[PDB]
Amino acid sequence: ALFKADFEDGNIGNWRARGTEKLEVVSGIGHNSNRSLKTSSRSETYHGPLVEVLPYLQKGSTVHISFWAMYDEGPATQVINGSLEKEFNRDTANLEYAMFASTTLNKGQWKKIEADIIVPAESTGISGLRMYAETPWKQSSEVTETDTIPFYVDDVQITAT
Numbered sequence: 329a330l331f332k333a334d335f336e337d338g339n340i341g342n343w344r345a346r347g348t349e350k351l352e353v354v355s356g357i358g359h360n361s362n363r364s365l366k367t368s369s370r371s372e373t374y375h376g377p378l379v380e381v382l383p384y385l386q387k388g389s390t391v392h393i394s395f396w397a398m399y400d401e402g403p404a405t406q407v408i409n410g411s412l413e414k415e416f417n418r419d420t421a422n423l424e425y426a427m428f429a430s431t432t433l434n435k436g437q438w439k440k441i442e443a444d445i446i447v448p449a450e451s452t453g454i455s456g457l458r459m460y461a462e463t464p465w466k467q468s469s470e471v472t473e474t475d476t477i478p479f480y481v482d483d484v485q486i487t488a489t
């Protein structure tokens with residue numbers, strides 16, 4: 329148990345948007361609970377809730393990340409991805425991204441996204457590693473309504489292996 333977010337305290341914490349989207353801890357919508365993190369006002373596939381997690385982890389280790397996600401408007405099914413944003417040498421202009429997991433969700437039902445991930449070693453110069461959720465990438469030219477639907481995440485956990 330290295331990191332846990334259940335949002336039951338109502339606090340956004342260090343969770344942030346990636347662009348112009350809106351994040352809000354809502355009540356009355358949750359995974360077997362009353363609170364969760366809603367992301368809305370998405371206008372890119374890459375808009376989604378993100379949190380910095382490097383400080384919780386040991387560089388050079390393997391950890392297990394999971395979370396639950398739900399959407400309740402738009403298409404009948406939609407893919408949601410779990411991804412990592414990585415910063416090296418404190419160079420904010422040259423960020424990297426990787427999908428670590430993907431599942432197809434049915435409208436209105438909660439489902440788990442999970443995978444092992446590798447935390448790069450110290451000698452890489454890694455300086456940020458942030459987990460986030462999104463829909464499949466993208467492209468601004470081609471982004472649609474179904475791609476940018478609002479969605480909920482809950483019960484985010486990272487664990488040792």
Ligand SMILES: O[C@@H]1[C@@H](O)[C@H](O[C@@H]2CO[C@@H](O[C@@H]3CO[C@@H](O[C@@H]4CO[C@@H](O)[C@H](O)[C@H]4O)[C@H](O)[C@H]3O)[C@H](O)[C@H]2O)OC[C@H]1O
Pocket residue numbers: 346347348373374411424425426427462465
């Ligand atoms: O292996 C490939 C993967 O690397 C790739 O991952 C996608 C890479 O693009 C990601 O979208 C990025 C997200 O960051 C945006 O920058 C923001 C916009 O400017 C400011 O508002 C803000 O400060 C920045 O954070 C960037 O514009 C956008 O392109 C996407 O989420 C990843 O899924 O996927 C394809 C694989 O082949």
Ligand SMILES: [Ca+2]
Pocket residue numbers: 334335336358359361362363364482483
């Ligand atoms: Ca919750």
